[PDB]
Design a protein around this ligand. Structure first.
Ligand SMILES: CC(=O)c1cccc(O)c1
Ligand SMILES: [Cl-]
Length: 115
């Protein structure tokens, strides 16, 4: 509360660490459904069903331009990619399996890096 400070977690390397994690996700062989925004004009259902589209290239643009106030907002966008994927794809489709794999990959990197 006012003039009562909780001890300061060092956040100075967060930007660099999120960038490295994102690089590792960008180069994973199962990243291909997530590299670019889903084409809303070529993919039936997507625009109406998925209220907040997100993809790796959009996360990268946002990270590169100061649009994440903190490491948790970055993680929320990453998770949104995989949450959207589950909403729109069957668990046992190539894209559906790619999403589950990439989520598992991300969360281990997240835990190992920050937690
Ligand atoms: C990421 C996703 O859910 C997707 C990507 C390309 C085509 C498609 O039908 C769905
Ligand atoms: Cl499917």
């Amino acid at each position: 509360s006012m003039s009562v400070k909780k001890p300061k977690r060092d956040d100075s390397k967060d930007l660099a660490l999120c960038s490295m994690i994102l690089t590792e996700m960008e180069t994973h062989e199962d990243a291909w459904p997530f590299l670019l925004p889903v084409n809303l004009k070529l993919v039936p259902g997507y625009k109406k069903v998925i209220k907040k589209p997100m993809d790796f290239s959009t996360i990268r643009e946002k990270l590169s331009s100061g649009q994440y106030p903190n490491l948790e907002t970055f993680a929320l966008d990453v998770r949104l990619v995989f949450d959207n994927c589950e909403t729109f794809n069957e668990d046992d489709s190539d894209i559906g399996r790619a999403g589950h794999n990439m989520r598992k990959y991300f969360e281990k990197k997240w835990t190992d890096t920050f937690k």
